[PDB]
UniProtKB/Swiss-Prot annotation, chain A:
The gene is PRKDC. Belongs to the PI3/PI4-kinase family. Serine/threonine-protein kinase that acts as a molecular sensor for DNA damage. Involved in DNA non-homologous end joining (NHEJ) required for double-strand break (DSB) repair and V(D)J recombination. Must be bound to DNA to express its catalytic properties. Promotes processing of hairpin DNA structures in V(D)J recombination by activation of the hairpin endonuclease artemis (DCLRE1C). Recruited by XRCC5 and XRCC6 to DNA ends and is required to (1) protect and align broken ends of DNA, thereby preventing their degradation, (2) and sequester the DSB for repair by NHEJ. DNA-PK is a heterotrimer of PRKDC and the Ku dimer (composed of XRCC6/Ku70 and XRCC5/Ku86). Formation of this complex may be promoted by interaction with ILF3. Component of the core long-range non-homologous end joining (NHEJ) complex (also named DNA-PK complex) composed of PRKDC, LIG4, XRCC4, XRCC6/Ku70, XRCC5/Ku86 and NHEJ1/XLF. Additional component of the NHEJ complex includes PAXX. Following autophosphorylation, PRKDC dissociates from DNA. Interacts with DNA-PKcs-interacting protein (KIP) with the region upstream the kinase domain. This is DNA-dependent protein kinase catalytic subunit. Autophosphorylated at two clusters, the T2609 cluster and the S2056 cluster. Autophosphorylation induces a conformational change that leads to remodeling of the DNA-PK complex, requisite for efficient end processing and DNA repair. TPR repeats lie at residues 101-134. It comes from the Eukaryota. It is found in: Nucleus; Nucleus, Nucleolus; Cytoplasm, Cytosol. The chain holds residues 1623 to 2359 of 4128 of the full protein. It comes from Homo sapiens (Human). The modification N6-acetyllysine is found at residues 348, 535.
From Swiss-Prot, chain B:
ADP-ribosylated by PARP3. This is X-ray repair cross-complementing protein 5. Single-stranded DNA-dependent ATP-dependent helicase that plays a key role in DNA non-homologous end joining (NHEJ) by recruiting DNA-PK to DNA. Required for double-strand break repair and V(D)J recombination. Also has a role in chromosome translocation. The DNA helicase II complex binds preferentially to fork-like ends of double-stranded DNA in a cell cycle-dependent manner. It works in the 3'-5' direction. During NHEJ, the XRCC5-XRRC6 dimer performs the recognition step: it recognizes and binds to the broken ends of the DNA and protects them from further resection. It is found in: Nucleus; Nucleus, Nucleolus; Chromosome. The gene is XRCC5. Heterodimer composed of XRCC5/Ku80 and XRCC6/Ku70; heterodimerization stabilizes XRCC5 protein. Component of the core long-range non-homologous end joining (NHEJ) complex (also named DNA-PK complex) composed of PRKDC, LIG4, XRCC4, XRCC6/Ku70, XRCC5/Ku86 and NHEJ1/XLF. Additional component of the NHEJ complex includes PAXX. Following autophosphorylation, PRKDC dissociates from DNA, leading to formation of the short-range NHEJ complex, composed of LIG4, XRCC4, XRCC6/Ku70, XRCC5/Ku86 and NHEJ1/XLF. Individuals with systemic lupus erythematosus (SLE) and related disorders produce extremely large amounts of autoantibodies to XRCC6 and XRCC5. The EEXXXDDL motif is required for the interaction with catalytic subunit PRKDC and its recruitment to sites of DNA damage. Belongs to the ku80 family. Induction: In osteoblasts, by FGF2.
């Protein structure tokens, strides 16, 4: 390092490019082995070296890759750089604006420009990792926060997770202050970007700070955050109030997480460290005002919607946040389950979950590639934690209010989406409610029993519902009460209606659904035998279509061997005559073979139960077999 | 209603 003055022959504009890369590597190596003992703080004429790199990054006659190596600098030249960062500001800014287009997704992977872009990103991230520089941190952030999910952000998130888990406590505290600043500064920027800051970087960062380091940030922000939370929702005559709402958003999304990861004795105890909602000079004995945030949370928590608002979705998601917050505070501070209800599921005729979800999302179900499929919808995981915790916290009233919202609002006063949401809660919360079943099957069944459940066909939704039911049956066994019968009949009818599917084994799985559906709780379950006959009456030689009825009758048979023409809108003779007439079709195996199998099982039923139709059915079977006999031996 | 939050 000491003789380095001669290096001006290198870096040279007239120097060939390869030497430019090489000498930088020399620097990188030397900066590794030095541990920054000298030529970083006081010793040595820094201005020459620093100005050299200022120009070097500032160059225009260099490839992007010379910059790419050149951004290995930042791991150094960013420690104890009292002032002079602003040269770094201007040069870094001009670089990033020079070579990082905002809208990335018009360049396909494998594009050389895309490769340069990702390489520069990675190099910047390594610089961030080795540097922990707050200015580098913030620069990275505004790189990220321009739109959502546009630069393979899994690597940025991994990096940001990495930065927090290391470094001196004050270092993280400063990083936190930095990442906080650009959320709150009054500069009018895109509100979407504002949300994205705390979302994609800050929320994670706080999630992964070191222990004991959180109270620093909570202490740092708490009073101003709460003050902003006080009020000011009033002004709406300007769309820019969107900025205001987003400001509240992030504040929520950070306070809540702060309630998490913090021990109960540090958010509430006889000694109240966080006593700063008030002046705290006199209120040092006991914590009761940190709660006051939930008192604030109420008002947005139950906000009577406008009539013709303009920020609908934003309002909605905002309320969603405030709810998540409420869940956090309830699960952190209060202990009694009556206070787990403390305000969390108390509801006014102007009510809460009627707010939290949209009503216009068609919101379809799937059987698609690669639980989280549309549990991605907001608020879910907090509710899940809530229910699991309270179950480990031993409530029927709390489920009682939900099932009020479910079946007492089984009326269409609540749109279907809301029902599906409640259900999906029940779905993923199955284990928690394994006991409290008997008084729930009929509502949940009533859900799928609707002629409207999502769209059409066996939704993954109805698969879930029926799975819940069946799984419940072995203990709850809810079979045979006046609503149970009519619902279940609707269910069997609907299921057996659509068992067919284009897909190879999805059909099989639906058939297995039917199988377990009947067999697990076969009582008072009329089997729609008319439906069956249409499902196998397909006088069509080269068709599939008779097979589905074949197999379906096969289920109704194999379960328990029940009677097979109780005034089913068809008469026995032609009923079975068509059934046997099936085995005429030799053109597909699953048609005739399965036909024979089902017929044989039918014979067994009729024999050991000694009915009278066995004679006629035997004669018919015999006749059609013979009509094969002399004709086509193989079949 | 503040009683529930208070207690």
């Amino acid at each position: 390092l000491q003789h380095w003055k001669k290096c001006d022959s290198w870096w040279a504009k007239d120097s060939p490019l390869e030497t430019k890369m090489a000498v930088l590597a020399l620097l990188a190596k030397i900066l590794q082995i030095d541990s920054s003992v000298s030529f970083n703080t006081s010793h040595g004429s820094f201005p020459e070296v620093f100005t050299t790199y200022i120009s070097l990054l500032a160059d225009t006659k260099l490839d992007l890759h010379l910059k790419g190596q050149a951004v290995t600098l930042l791991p150094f030249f960013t420690s104890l750089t009292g002032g002079s960062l602003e040269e770094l500001r201007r040069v870094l800014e001009q670089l990033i604006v020079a070579h990082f287009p905002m809208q990335s997704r018009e360049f396909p992977p494998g594009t050389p420009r895309f490769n340069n872009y990702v390489d520069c990103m990675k190099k910047f991230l390594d610089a961030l990792e080795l540097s922990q520089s707050p200015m580098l941190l913030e620069l990275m952030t505004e790189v990220l926060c321009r739109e959502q999910q546009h630069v393979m952000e899994e690597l940025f998130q991994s990096s940001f997770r990495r930065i927090a888990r290391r470094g001196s406590c004050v270092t993280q505290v400063g990083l936190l202050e930095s990442v906080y600043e650009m959320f709150r500064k009054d500069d009018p920027r895109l509100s979407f970007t504002r949300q994205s800051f705390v979302d994609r970087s800050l929320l994670t960062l706080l999630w992964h700070c070191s222990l004991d380091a959180l109270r620093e940030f909570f202490s740092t922000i708490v009073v101003d955050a709460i003050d902003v939370l006080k009020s000011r929702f009033t002004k709406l005559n300007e769309s820019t109030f969107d900025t205001q709402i987003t400001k509240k958003m992030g504040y929520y999304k950070i306070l809540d997480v702060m309630y998490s990861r913090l021990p109960k004795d540090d958010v509430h105890a006889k000694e109240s460290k966080i006593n700063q909602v008030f002046h705290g000079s006199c209120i040092t004995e006991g914590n009761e005002l940190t709660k006051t945030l939930i008192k604030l949370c109420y008002d947005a928590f139950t906000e009577n919607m406008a009539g013709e608002n303009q920020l609908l979705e934003r309002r909605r998601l905002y309320h969603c946040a405030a709810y998540n917050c409420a869940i956090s505070v309830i699960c952190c501070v209060f202990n009694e389950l009556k206070f787990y209800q403390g305000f969390l599921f108390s509801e006014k005729p102007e009510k809460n979950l009627l707010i939290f979800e949209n009503l216009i999302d068609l919101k379809r179900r799937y059987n698609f590639p690669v639980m989280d499929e549309l549990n991605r919808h907001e608020c879910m995981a907090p509710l899940t934690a809530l229910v699991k915790h309270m179950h480990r916290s031993l409530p029927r009233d709390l489920p009682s209010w939900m099932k009020f919202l479910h079946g007492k609002l089984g009326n269409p006063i609540v749109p279907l989406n809301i029902r599906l949401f409640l259900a999906k809660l029940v779905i993923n919360t199955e284990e928690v409610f394994r006991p409290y079943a008997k008084h729930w099957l009929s509502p949940l069944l009533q859900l799928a029993a609707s002629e409207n459940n999502g769209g059409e066909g066996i939704h993954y939704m109805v698969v879930e519902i029926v799975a819940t039911i069946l799984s419940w049956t072995g203990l709850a066994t809810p079979t045979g009460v006046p609503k149970d019968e009519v619902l279940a009949n609707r269910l069997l009818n609907f299921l057996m209606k659509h068992v067919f599917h284009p897909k190879r084994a999805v059909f099989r799985h639906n058939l297995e659904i039917i199988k377990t559906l009947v067999e697990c709780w076969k009582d008072c379950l009329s089997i729609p035998y008319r439906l069956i006959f249409e499902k196998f009456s397909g006088k069509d030689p080269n068709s599939k279509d008779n097979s589905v009825g074949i197999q379906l009758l096969g289920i109704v048979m194999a379960n328990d061997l029940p009677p097979y023409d109780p005034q089913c809108g068809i008469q026995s003779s032609e009923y079975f005559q068509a059934l046997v007439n099936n085995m005429s079709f030799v053109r597909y195996k699953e048609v005739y073979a399965a036909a024979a199998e089902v017929l044989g099982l039918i014979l067994r039923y009729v024999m050991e139960r000694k009915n009278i139709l066995e004679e006629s059915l035997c004669e018919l079977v015999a006749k059609q077999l013979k009509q094969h006999q002399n004709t086509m031996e193989d079949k | 209603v503040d009683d529930l939050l208070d207690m």
